[PDB]
Amino acid sequence: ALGKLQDVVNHNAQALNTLVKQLSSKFGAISSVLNDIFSRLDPPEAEVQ
Amino acid sequence: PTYGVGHQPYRVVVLSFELLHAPATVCGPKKSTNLVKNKCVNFNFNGLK
Amino acid sequence: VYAWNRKRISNCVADYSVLYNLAPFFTFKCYGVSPTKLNDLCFTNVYADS
Amino acid sequence: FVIRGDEVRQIAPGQTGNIADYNYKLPDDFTGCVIAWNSNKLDSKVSGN
C-alpha cells in the first residue's frame, strides 16, 4: 500500500549504511584505521600511504 | 680470507611480526597509568591508539 | 639457507633499540614498518630466521 | 663536520642510528644537499682527538 513512501526511506537508509561500510575498505594501504599508519611508518611513507 | 668486497658473506636475519587482533606478547618498553572511566581521554591500549 | 633457525619467541619487554650499535654496515630495510618506530607497537609473535 | 664511517651514509632524513642522533640533524624537509669526502690522507691524525 505505502510502497512509494518506503522506497525513499530505504534508499536514504542504504545510502548511509553503504557510506559507513566503505571506511573499513583499504584503498591501497596496509590498514584501515587512521591510528595505524601513523604508528608504524615513517613520515616519508606516512604522507604517501 | 683476502676475497673481494662483494664476495664476502653476510649473515642476514629476516625476523617478521604479525600485527592483528590476537593478544600481543612482544612489545616495546613503556609504562602504564591509571584508568579513568567517566572522562574523554586518550588511550593506547595494546597498540590500539 | 639449507637449514633455517626459526625460534618463535614468547612474551617479553625486549627493546628493539639494542642492535643500533651492531657491526658496521647494518642496513634496516623495513618493507611495511619503520625502523625507529619499533618502540611502541605491541607485536603478537616474532618469527626469527638465520 | 668531521663525522666519519658508514654513519656518514647513515646521515639522512630519519634513519636514526647510534651516531646520527647526537651529531647532526635537520628538520624533516632537507631542502638542500650534503657533500661528503674521504679525508684519509688529508686529516690523518693519530692523537689529534
JSON list of C-alpha atoms in Angstrom, two decimals:
[
{"chain": "A", "resi": 1, "resn": "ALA", "atom": "CA", "xyz": [0.00, 0.00, 0.00]},
{"chain": "A", "resi": 2, "resn": "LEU", "atom": "CA", "xyz": [2.64, 2.58, 1.03]},
{"chain": "A", "resi": 3, "resn": "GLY", "atom": "CA", "xyz": [5.26, 1.40, -1.42]},
{"chain": "A", "resi": 4, "resn": "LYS", "atom": "CA", "xyz": [6.49, 4.67, -2.89]},
{"chain": "A", "resi": 5, "resn": "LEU", "atom": "CA", "xyz": [6.95, 6.18, 0.59]},
{"chain": "A", "resi": 6, "resn": "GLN", "atom": "CA", "xyz": [9.05, 3.30, 1.95]},
{"chain": "A", "resi": 7, "resn": "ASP", "atom": "CA", "xyz": [11.24, 3.32, -1.17]},
{"chain": "A", "resi": 8, "resn": "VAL", "atom": "CA", "xyz": [12.78, 6.74, -0.48]},
{"chain": "A", "resi": 9, "resn": "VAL", "atom": "CA", "xyz": [13.29, 5.82, 3.19]},
{"chain": "A", "resi": 10, "resn": "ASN", "atom": "CA", "xyz": [15.05, 2.58, 2.25]},
{"chain": "A", "resi": 11, "resn": "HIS", "atom": "CA", "xyz": [17.17, 4.48, -0.28]},
{"chain": "A", "resi": 12, "resn": "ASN", "atom": "CA", "xyz": [18.18, 7.13, 2.27]},
{"chain": "A", "resi": 13, "resn": "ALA", "atom": "CA", "xyz": [18.97, 4.34, 4.76]},
{"chain": "A", "resi": 14, "resn": "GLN", "atom": "CA", "xyz": [21.10, 2.27, 2.37]},
{"chain": "A", "resi": 15, "resn": "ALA", "atom": "CA", "xyz": [22.94, 5.41, 1.23]},
{"chain": "A", "resi": 16, "resn": "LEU", "atom": "CA", "xyz": [24.02, 5.93, 4.85]},
{"chain": "A", "resi": 17, "resn": "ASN", "atom": "CA", "xyz": [24.69, 2.23, 5.54]},
{"chain": "A", "resi": 18, "resn": "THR", "atom": "CA", "xyz": [26.89, 1.89, 2.45]},
{"chain": "A", "resi": 19, "resn": "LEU", "atom": "CA", "xyz": [28.76, 5.11, 3.28]},
{"chain": "A", "resi": 20, "resn": "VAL", "atom": "CA", "xyz": [29.95, 3.76, 6.65]},
{"chain": "A", "resi": 21, "resn": "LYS", "atom": "CA", "xyz": [30.88, 0.27, 5.40]},
{"chain": "A", "resi": 22, "resn": "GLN", "atom": "CA", "xyz": [33.41, 1.76, 2.96]},
{"chain": "A", "resi": 23, "resn": "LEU", "atom": "CA", "xyz": [35.50, 3.15, 5.83]},
{"chain": "A", "resi": 24, "resn": "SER", "atom": "CA", "xyz": [36.71, -0.40, 6.58]},
{"chain": "A", "resi": 25, "resn": "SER", "atom": "CA", "xyz": [37.89, -0.85, 2.98]},
{"chain": "A", "resi": 26, "resn": "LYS", "atom": "CA", "xyz": [41.58, -0.15, 2.35]},
{"chain": "A", "resi": 27, "resn": "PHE", "atom": "CA", "xyz": [42.22, 1.75, -0.89]},
{"chain": "A", "resi": 28, "resn": "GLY", "atom": "CA", "xyz": [45.81, 0.51, -1.20]},
{"chain": "A", "resi": 29, "resn": "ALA", "atom": "CA", "xyz": [47.17, 0.91, 2.33]},
{"chain": "A", "resi": 30, "resn": "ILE", "atom": "CA", "xyz": [48.32, -1.61, 4.93]},
{"chain": "A", "resi": 31, "resn": "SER", "atom": "CA", "xyz": [45.44, -0.82, 7.31]},
{"chain": "A", "resi": 32, "resn": "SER", "atom": "CA", "xyz": [42.05, 0.89, 7.55]},
{"chain": "A", "resi": 33, "resn": "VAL", "atom": "CA", "xyz": [42.09, 2.51, 11.00]},
{"chain": "A", "resi": 34, "resn": "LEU", "atom": "CA", "xyz": [43.55, 6.02, 10.96]},
{"chain": "A", "resi": 35, "resn": "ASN", "atom": "CA", "xyz": [45.76, 5.49, 14.04]},
{"chain": "A", "resi": 36, "resn": "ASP", "atom": "CA", "xyz": [47.60, 2.57, 12.44]},
{"chain": "A", "resi": 37, "resn": "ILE", "atom": "CA", "xyz": [49.64, 4.09, 9.62]},
{"chain": "A", "resi": 38, "resn": "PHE", "atom": "CA", "xyz": [50.85, 6.99, 11.80]},
{"chain": "A", "resi": 39, "resn": "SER", "atom": "CA", "xyz": [52.05, 4.44, 14.38]},
{"chain": "A", "resi": 40, "resn": "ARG", "atom": "CA", "xyz": [54.12, 2.01, 12.27]},
{"chain": "A", "resi": 41, "resn": "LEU", "atom": "CA", "xyz": [55.63, 4.01, 9.38]},
{"chain": "A", "resi": 42, "resn": "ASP", "atom": "CA", "xyz": [57.92, 7.00, 8.95]},
{"chain": "A", "resi": 43, "resn": "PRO", "atom": "CA", "xyz": [56.66, 10.41, 7.77]},
{"chain": "A", "resi": 44, "resn": "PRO", "atom": "CA", "xyz": [58.14, 9.95, 4.26]},
{"chain": "A", "resi": 45, "resn": "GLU", "atom": "CA", "xyz": [55.99, 6.83, 3.92]},
{"chain": "A", "resi": 46, "resn": "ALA", "atom": "CA", "xyz": [53.12, 8.04, 6.12]},
{"chain": "A", "resi": 47, "resn": "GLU", "atom": "CA", "xyz": [52.46, 11.09, 3.93]},
{"chain": "A", "resi": 48, "resn": "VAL", "atom": "CA", "xyz": [52.35, 8.72, 0.93]},
{"chain": "A", "resi": 49, "resn": "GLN", "atom": "CA", "xyz": [50.29, 5.75, 2.15]},
{"chain": "B", "resi": 1, "resn": "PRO", "atom": "CA", "xyz": [90.32, -14.68, 3.57]},
{"chain": "B", "resi": 2, "resn": "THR", "atom": "CA", "xyz": [91.51, -11.89, 1.26]},
{"chain": "B", "resi": 3, "resn": "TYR", "atom": "CA", "xyz": [88.50, -12.08, -1.04]},
{"chain": "B", "resi": 4, "resn": "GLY", "atom": "CA", "xyz": [86.62, -9.31, -2.79]},
{"chain": "B", "resi": 5, "resn": "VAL", "atom": "CA", "xyz": [84.18, -6.94, -1.13]},
{"chain": "B", "resi": 6, "resn": "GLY", "atom": "CA", "xyz": [81.13, -8.45, -2.82]},
{"chain": "B", "resi": 7, "resn": "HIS", "atom": "CA", "xyz": [82.44, -11.99, -2.31]},
{"chain": "B", "resi": 8, "resn": "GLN", "atom": "CA", "xyz": [82.31, -11.62, 1.48]},
{"chain": "B", "resi": 9, "resn": "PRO", "atom": "CA", "xyz": [79.27, -13.36, 3.01]},
{"chain": "B", "resi": 10, "resn": "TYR", "atom": "CA", "xyz": [76.58, -11.57, 5.01]},
{"chain": "B", "resi": 11, "resn": "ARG", "atom": "CA", "xyz": [74.66, -13.06, 7.92]},
{"chain": "B", "resi": 12, "resn": "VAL", "atom": "CA", "xyz": [71.08, -11.91, 7.30]},
{"chain": "B", "resi": 13, "resn": "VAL", "atom": "CA", "xyz": [68.12, -12.09, 9.69]},
{"chain": "B", "resi": 14, "resn": "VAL", "atom": "CA", "xyz": [64.61, -11.64, 8.30]},
{"chain": "B", "resi": 15, "resn": "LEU", "atom": "CA", "xyz": [62.60, -11.73, 11.53]},
{"chain": "B", "resi": 16, "resn": "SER", "atom": "CA", "xyz": [58.98, -10.69, 10.97]},
{"chain": "B", "resi": 17, "resn": "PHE", "atom": "CA", "xyz": [55.90, -9.98, 13.07]},
{"chain": "B", "resi": 18, "resn": "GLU", "atom": "CA", "xyz": [52.10, -10.25, 12.79]},
{"chain": "B", "resi": 19, "resn": "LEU", "atom": "CA", "xyz": [50.09, -7.16, 13.75]},
{"chain": "B", "resi": 20, "resn": "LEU", "atom": "CA", "xyz": [46.50, -8.30, 14.32]},
{"chain": "B", "resi": 21, "resn": "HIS", "atom": "CA", "xyz": [43.80, -8.63, 16.99]},
{"chain": "B", "resi": 22, "resn": "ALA", "atom": "CA", "xyz": [45.41, -11.56, 18.83]},
{"chain": "B", "resi": 23, "resn": "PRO", "atom": "CA", "xyz": [46.83, -10.83, 22.31]},
{"chain": "B", "resi": 24, "resn": "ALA", "atom": "CA", "xyz": [50.28, -9.36, 21.77]},
{"chain": "B", "resi": 25, "resn": "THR", "atom": "CA", "xyz": [53.28, -10.88, 23.54]},
{"chain": "B", "resi": 26, "resn": "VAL", "atom": "CA", "xyz": [56.42, -8.99, 22.43]},
{"chain": "B", "resi": 27, "resn": "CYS", "atom": "CA", "xyz": [56.17, -5.22, 22.93]},
{"chain": "B", "resi": 28, "resn": "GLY", "atom": "CA", "xyz": [58.44, -2.24, 23.45]},
{"chain": "B", "resi": 29, "resn": "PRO", "atom": "CA", "xyz": [59.47, -0.92, 26.86]},
{"chain": "B", "resi": 30, "resn": "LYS", "atom": "CA", "xyz": [56.90, 1.61, 28.06]},
{"chain": "B", "resi": 31, "resn": "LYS", "atom": "CA", "xyz": [54.95, 2.39, 31.24]},
{"chain": "B", "resi": 32, "resn": "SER", "atom": "CA", "xyz": [51.33, 2.33, 32.41]},
{"chain": "B", "resi": 33, "resn": "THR", "atom": "CA", "xyz": [48.99, 4.74, 34.19]},
{"chain": "B", "resi": 34, "resn": "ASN", "atom": "CA", "xyz": [45.65, 4.61, 35.98]},
{"chain": "B", "resi": 35, "resn": "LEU", "atom": "CA", "xyz": [42.36, 4.13, 34.13]},
{"chain": "B", "resi": 36, "resn": "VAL", "atom": "CA", "xyz": [39.70, 6.84, 34.22]},
{"chain": "B", "resi": 37, "resn": "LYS", "atom": "CA", "xyz": [36.09, 5.93, 33.42]},
{"chain": "B", "resi": 38, "resn": "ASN", "atom": "CA", "xyz": [33.81, 8.97, 33.02]},
{"chain": "B", "resi": 39, "resn": "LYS", "atom": "CA", "xyz": [36.27, 11.21, 31.18]},
{"chain": "B", "resi": 40, "resn": "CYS", "atom": "CA", "xyz": [37.08, 11.68, 27.49]},
{"chain": "B", "resi": 41, "resn": "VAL", "atom": "CA", "xyz": [40.81, 10.92, 27.31]},
{"chain": "B", "resi": 42, "resn": "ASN", "atom": "CA", "xyz": [43.42, 9.39, 25.04]},
{"chain": "B", "resi": 43, "resn": "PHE", "atom": "CA", "xyz": [44.12, 5.66, 25.22]},
{"chain": "B", "resi": 44, "resn": "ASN", "atom": "CA", "xyz": [46.92, 3.43, 23.89]},
{"chain": "B", "resi": 45, "resn": "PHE", "atom": "CA", "xyz": [45.52, 0.02, 24.81]},
{"chain": "B", "resi": 46, "resn": "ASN", "atom": "CA", "xyz": [47.88, -2.69, 23.48]},
{"chain": "B", "resi": 47, "resn": "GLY", "atom": "CA", "xyz": [48.72, -0.74, 20.32]},
{"chain": "B", "resi": 48, "resn": "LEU", "atom": "CA", "xyz": [45.14, 0.39, 19.75]},
{"chain": "B", "resi": 49, "resn": "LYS", "atom": "CA", "xyz": [45.53, 4.17, 19.97]},
{"chain": "C", "resi": 1, "resn": "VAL", "atom": "CA", "xyz": [69.94, -21.36, 3.77]},
{"chain": "C", "resi": 2, "resn": "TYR", "atom": "CA", "xyz": [69.77, -25.17, 3.77]},
{"chain": "C", "resi": 3, "resn": "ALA", "atom": "CA", "xyz": [68.65, -25.42, 7.42]},
{"chain": "C", "resi": 4, "resn": "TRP", "atom": "CA", "xyz": [66.74, -22.48, 8.88]},
{"chain": "C", "resi": 5, "resn": "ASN", "atom": "CA", "xyz": [66.84, -21.40, 12.53]},
{"chain": "C", "resi": 6, "resn": "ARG", "atom": "CA", "xyz": [63.27, -20.36, 13.36]},
{"chain": "C", "resi": 7, "resn": "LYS", "atom": "CA", "xyz": [62.85, -19.50, 17.06]},
{"chain": "C", "resi": 8, "resn": "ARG", "atom": "CA", "xyz": [59.29, -18.44, 17.91]},
{"chain": "C", "resi": 9, "resn": "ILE", "atom": "CA", "xyz": [59.97, -16.26, 20.96]},
{"chain": "C", "resi": 10, "resn": "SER", "atom": "CA", "xyz": [57.44, -15.59, 23.73]},
{"chain": "C", "resi": 11, "resn": "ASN", "atom": "CA", "xyz": [56.23, -12.59, 25.73]},
{"chain": "C", "resi": 12, "resn": "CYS", "atom": "CA", "xyz": [58.95, -10.18, 26.87]},
{"chain": "C", "resi": 13, "resn": "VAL", "atom": "CA", "xyz": [59.82, -6.48, 27.04]},
{"chain": "C", "resi": 14, "resn": "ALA", "atom": "CA", "xyz": [62.68, -6.65, 24.54]},
{"chain": "C", "resi": 15, "resn": "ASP", "atom": "CA", "xyz": [63.71, -3.15, 23.46]},
{"chain": "C", "resi": 16, "resn": "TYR", "atom": "CA", "xyz": [64.28, -3.19, 19.70]},
{"chain": "C", "resi": 17, "resn": "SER", "atom": "CA", "xyz": [66.69, -0.23, 20.05]},
{"chain": "C", "resi": 18, "resn": "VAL", "atom": "CA", "xyz": [69.54, -2.51, 21.18]},
{"chain": "C", "resi": 19, "resn": "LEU", "atom": "CA", "xyz": [71.15, -3.57, 17.88]},
{"chain": "C", "resi": 20, "resn": "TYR", "atom": "CA", "xyz": [71.63, 0.08, 16.87]},
{"chain": "C", "resi": 21, "resn": "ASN", "atom": "CA", "xyz": [75.34, -0.40, 17.70]},
{"chain": "C", "resi": 22, "resn": "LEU", "atom": "CA", "xyz": [75.84, -3.64, 15.75]},
{"chain": "C", "resi": 23, "resn": "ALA", "atom": "CA", "xyz": [78.65, -4.47, 13.32]},
{"chain": "C", "resi": 24, "resn": "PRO", "atom": "CA", "xyz": [79.39, -1.86, 10.61]},
{"chain": "C", "resi": 25, "resn": "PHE", "atom": "CA", "xyz": [77.03, -1.68, 7.62]},
{"chain": "C", "resi": 26, "resn": "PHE", "atom": "CA", "xyz": [73.83, -2.61, 9.48]},
{"chain": "C", "resi": 27, "resn": "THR", "atom": "CA", "xyz": [71.12, -1.97, 6.91]},
{"chain": "C", "resi": 28, "resn": "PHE", "atom": "CA", "xyz": [67.47, -1.73, 8.00]},
{"chain": "C", "resi": 29, "resn": "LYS", "atom": "CA", "xyz": [65.11, -2.11, 5.03]},
{"chain": "C", "resi": 30, "resn": "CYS", "atom": "CA", "xyz": [61.71, -2.45, 6.71]},
{"chain": "C", "resi": 31, "resn": "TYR", "atom": "CA", "xyz": [59.15, -3.08, 3.94]},
{"chain": "C", "resi": 32, "resn": "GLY", "atom": "CA", "xyz": [55.95, -2.39, 5.85]},
{"chain": "C", "resi": 33, "resn": "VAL", "atom": "CA", "xyz": [57.10, -0.82, 9.12]},
{"chain": "C", "resi": 34, "resn": "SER", "atom": "CA", "xyz": [59.58, 1.83, 10.25]},
{"chain": "C", "resi": 35, "resn": "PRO", "atom": "CA", "xyz": [62.92, 1.15, 11.99]},
{"chain": "C", "resi": 36, "resn": "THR", "atom": "CA", "xyz": [62.75, 3.92, 14.60]},
{"chain": "C", "resi": 37, "resn": "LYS", "atom": "CA", "xyz": [59.03, 3.27, 15.16]},
{"chain": "C", "resi": 38, "resn": "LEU", "atom": "CA", "xyz": [59.66, -0.20, 16.63]},
{"chain": "C", "resi": 39, "resn": "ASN", "atom": "CA", "xyz": [59.47, 1.12, 20.20]},
{"chain": "C", "resi": 40, "resn": "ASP", "atom": "CA", "xyz": [55.72, 1.46, 20.96]},
{"chain": "C", "resi": 41, "resn": "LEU", "atom": "CA", "xyz": [53.87, -1.22, 18.95]},
{"chain": "C", "resi": 42, "resn": "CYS", "atom": "CA", "xyz": [52.93, -4.49, 20.66]},
{"chain": "C", "resi": 43, "resn": "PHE", "atom": "CA", "xyz": [53.64, -7.36, 18.27]},
{"chain": "C", "resi": 44, "resn": "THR", "atom": "CA", "xyz": [51.86, -10.70, 18.62]},
{"chain": "C", "resi": 45, "resn": "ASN", "atom": "CA", "xyz": [54.67, -13.13, 17.76]},
{"chain": "C", "resi": 46, "resn": "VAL", "atom": "CA", "xyz": [58.08, -12.66, 16.13]},
{"chain": "C", "resi": 47, "resn": "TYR", "atom": "CA", "xyz": [59.38, -15.29, 13.69]},
{"chain": "C", "resi": 48, "resn": "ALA", "atom": "CA", "xyz": [63.17, -15.06, 13.56]},
{"chain": "C", "resi": 49, "resn": "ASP", "atom": "CA", "xyz": [65.43, -16.72, 11.00]},
{"chain": "C", "resi": 50, "resn": "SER", "atom": "CA", "xyz": [69.12, -17.27, 10.31]},
{"chain": "D", "resi": 1, "resn": "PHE", "atom": "CA", "xyz": [81.65, 18.42, 10.48]},
{"chain": "D", "resi": 2, "resn": "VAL", "atom": "CA", "xyz": [84.23, 15.64, 10.53]},
{"chain": "D", "resi": 3, "resn": "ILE", "atom": "CA", "xyz": [81.88, 12.71, 11.13]},
{"chain": "D", "resi": 4, "resn": "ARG", "atom": "CA", "xyz": [83.29, 9.50, 9.68]},
{"chain": "D", "resi": 5, "resn": "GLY", "atom": "CA", "xyz": [82.44, 5.89, 8.92]},
{"chain": "D", "resi": 6, "resn": "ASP", "atom": "CA", "xyz": [79.31, 4.39, 7.44]},
{"chain": "D", "resi": 7, "resn": "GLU", "atom": "CA", "xyz": [77.38, 6.77, 9.70]},
{"chain": "D", "resi": 8, "resn": "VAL", "atom": "CA", "xyz": [78.17, 9.39, 7.04]},
{"chain": "D", "resi": 9, "resn": "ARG", "atom": "CA", "xyz": [75.99, 7.35, 4.70]},
{"chain": "D", "resi": 10, "resn": "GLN", "atom": "CA", "xyz": [73.54, 6.93, 7.59]},
{"chain": "D", "resi": 11, "resn": "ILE", "atom": "CA", "xyz": [73.28, 10.74, 7.76]},
{"chain": "D", "resi": 12, "resn": "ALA", "atom": "CA", "xyz": [69.89, 11.25, 6.08]},
{"chain": "D", "resi": 13, "resn": "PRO", "atom": "CA", "xyz": [66.34, 12.46, 6.89]},
{"chain": "D", "resi": 14, "resn": "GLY", "atom": "CA", "xyz": [65.35, 9.94, 9.53]},
{"chain": "D", "resi": 15, "resn": "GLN", "atom": "CA", "xyz": [67.29, 6.67, 9.83]},
{"chain": "D", "resi": 16, "resn": "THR", "atom": "CA", "xyz": [68.27, 7.24, 13.45]},
{"chain": "D", "resi": 17, "resn": "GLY", "atom": "CA", "xyz": [71.42, 5.32, 14.36]},
{"chain": "D", "resi": 18, "resn": "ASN", "atom": "CA", "xyz": [73.99, 5.26, 17.14]},
{"chain": "D", "resi": 19, "resn": "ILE", "atom": "CA", "xyz": [75.92, 8.32, 15.89]},
{"chain": "D", "resi": 20, "resn": "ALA", "atom": "CA", "xyz": [73.50, 10.35, 13.74]},
{"chain": "D", "resi": 21, "resn": "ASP", "atom": "CA", "xyz": [71.40, 11.18, 16.82]},
{"chain": "D", "resi": 22, "resn": "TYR", "atom": "CA", "xyz": [73.74, 13.44, 18.82]},
{"chain": "D", "resi": 23, "resn": "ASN", "atom": "CA", "xyz": [76.00, 14.60, 15.96]},
{"chain": "D", "resi": 24, "resn": "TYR", "atom": "CA", "xyz": [73.85, 16.44, 13.40]},
{"chain": "D", "resi": 25, "resn": "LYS", "atom": "CA", "xyz": [70.17, 16.60, 12.48]},
{"chain": "D", "resi": 26, "resn": "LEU", "atom": "CA", "xyz": [67.98, 18.63, 10.14]},
{"chain": "D", "resi": 27, "resn": "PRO", "atom": "CA", "xyz": [64.23, 19.31, 10.01]},
{"chain": "D", "resi": 28, "resn": "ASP", "atom": "CA", "xyz": [62.08, 16.81, 8.14]},
{"chain": "D", "resi": 29, "resn": "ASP", "atom": "CA", "xyz": [62.35, 18.63, 4.81]},
{"chain": "D", "resi": 30, "resn": "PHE", "atom": "CA", "xyz": [66.09, 18.60, 3.93]},
{"chain": "D", "resi": 31, "resn": "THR", "atom": "CA", "xyz": [65.72, 21.28, 1.25]},
{"chain": "D", "resi": 32, "resn": "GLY", "atom": "CA", "xyz": [69.36, 21.05, 0.26]},
{"chain": "D", "resi": 33, "resn": "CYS", "atom": "CA", "xyz": [72.33, 18.78, -0.34]},
{"chain": "D", "resi": 34, "resn": "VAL", "atom": "CA", "xyz": [75.02, 17.02, 1.70]},
{"chain": "D", "resi": 35, "resn": "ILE", "atom": "CA", "xyz": [78.56, 16.60, 0.34]},
{"chain": "D", "resi": 36, "resn": "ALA", "atom": "CA", "xyz": [80.99, 14.12, 1.87]},
{"chain": "D", "resi": 37, "resn": "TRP", "atom": "CA", "xyz": [84.52, 13.07, 1.02]},
{"chain": "D", "resi": 38, "resn": "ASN", "atom": "CA", "xyz": [87.06, 10.61, 2.41]},
{"chain": "D", "resi": 39, "resn": "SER", "atom": "CA", "xyz": [89.76, 12.61, 4.20]},
{"chain": "D", "resi": 40, "resn": "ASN", "atom": "CA", "xyz": [92.08, 9.65, 4.70]},
{"chain": "D", "resi": 41, "resn": "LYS", "atom": "CA", "xyz": [95.38, 11.27, 3.70]},
{"chain": "D", "resi": 42, "resn": "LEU", "atom": "CA", "xyz": [94.09, 14.79, 4.45]},
{"chain": "D", "resi": 43, "resn": "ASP", "atom": "CA", "xyz": [93.19, 14.68, 8.16]},
{"chain": "D", "resi": 44, "resn": "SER", "atom": "CA", "xyz": [95.22, 11.62, 9.18]},
{"chain": "D", "resi": 45, "resn": "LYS", "atom": "CA", "xyz": [95.73, 12.25, 12.91]},
{"chain": "D", "resi": 46, "resn": "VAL", "atom": "CA", "xyz": [96.75, 9.58, 15.41]},
{"chain": "D", "resi": 47, "resn": "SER", "atom": "CA", "xyz": [96.44, 11.57, 18.66]},
{"chain": "D", "resi": 48, "resn": "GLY", "atom": "CA", "xyz": [94.51, 14.59, 17.39]},
{"chain": "D", "resi": 49, "resn": "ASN", "atom": "CA", "xyz": [91.39, 13.70, 19.37]}
]
